[model samples]
Target: GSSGSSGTPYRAMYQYRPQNEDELELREGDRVDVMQQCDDGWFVGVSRRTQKFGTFPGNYVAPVSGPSSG
Candidate 1:
C-alpha cells in the first residue's frame, strides 16, 4: 500500500475506547493502517477491525514491523 500523506501505518500496542464520537476504538494488537502524527500529539488512521477512520492519541498505538509492516 502507499504511505500517502500519513506516515507509515502501525498496529495498536494497547487497546483504546473512543472518548468521543470522532475517535476510533482499538483493540490490543489491532491494525491501524494509516497514521499521521499531529502537532497536538494525536494520530489519524483507519482501524482494521471496525473499518472506522479517526484520530487517536499517538500513545495509543505503536509501529508494526515484518511482513505486516506498512
Candidate 2:
C-alpha cells in the first residue's frame, strides 16, 4: 500500500516463506498483521511468521502510487 499522504511507494521487505505447513496459506496482497521479530529492527507478518515486512534491500517491489508506464 502507498503511504496515505505522501503517495510514496511503500514496499514490503520480506518474502513469505512458511516456517511450517500452517504458514503457507497466505498469498501476496493478503491483509496481514505484523509484529517485530527479536527486536532486531525488523517486522514480520504475524499471520505468516516467515515473511519480512519492510523495504527489503536489493529487491524490486513496485510502487503503489506513481507515474504508470501505461
Candidate 3:
C-alpha cells in the first residue's frame, strides 16, 4: 500500500468476523483485511467479528479513500 500524509491516515485497526461457524479460527495478531461491516459497526468475515480497535501503525494497512494525484 502507498502512503499519503496529506490525507487523513487510516490508522484505525479493524476486526474480522467469520460469517459461518467454520470461520471461527483466527490467531492473535493475524494479518487480515476487513471484508464487510455489520449494523453495529463490527466487521464481518470468516472469523470472530471485530471493530475499529484503535489507531494502528500506518505500515499495517491502507487508506480506503483520499486525495489522488491524478
Candidate 4:
C-alpha cells in the first residue's frame, strides 16, 4: 500500500504481545499508522493506543481500506 516511507493507517488483525524493546505492543482491532517496512516481516509504525512508534509484525496489521480514507 506504499512505495515506502510516511504513515498509512492500518488495523490490527490479531492481538500481538511484544517480546522485545523495539516492538510495539498491540491489541486486536487496534489502529496504527504504519510508517515503513523493513527486511523480514517487520513493520515500523506508531500505535495510537500508546502514542509510541516502534517495530511490529507486518502480518499483525492490515492496511485500513476505505473510500480513499482510513
lDDT against true structure, model 1 = 0.78
Clash pairs, model 1 backbone: none
Residue-level lDDT tens digits of model 3 in 1-70: 9973222323224333435544433344454344544454543332222422322223333444457565
* Ranking 1 against 2 by TM-score, winner: 1
TM-score quality measure for candidate 1: 0.72
Query: How many angstroms is residue 70 displaced in model 4 relative to the true structure, after the best TM-score fit?
Result: 16
Question: lDDT score of model 4?
Answer: 0.86
Q: Write the residue-wise lDDT of candidate 1 on 28-58 in tens digits.
A: 8888875567888788878888878888877
| Displacement of the residue 12 alpha carbon in candidate 1, Å | 0.8
Candidate 4: tens digits of C-alpha lDDT, residues 1-70:
7585468898888999999868998889999898888889679989989988889998888888656833
| Winning candidate number (lDDT) | 4
Candidate whose TM-score is highest:
4
**Which pairs clash inside model 3?**
17-45, 17-48, 17-49, 18-45, 18-46, 18-47
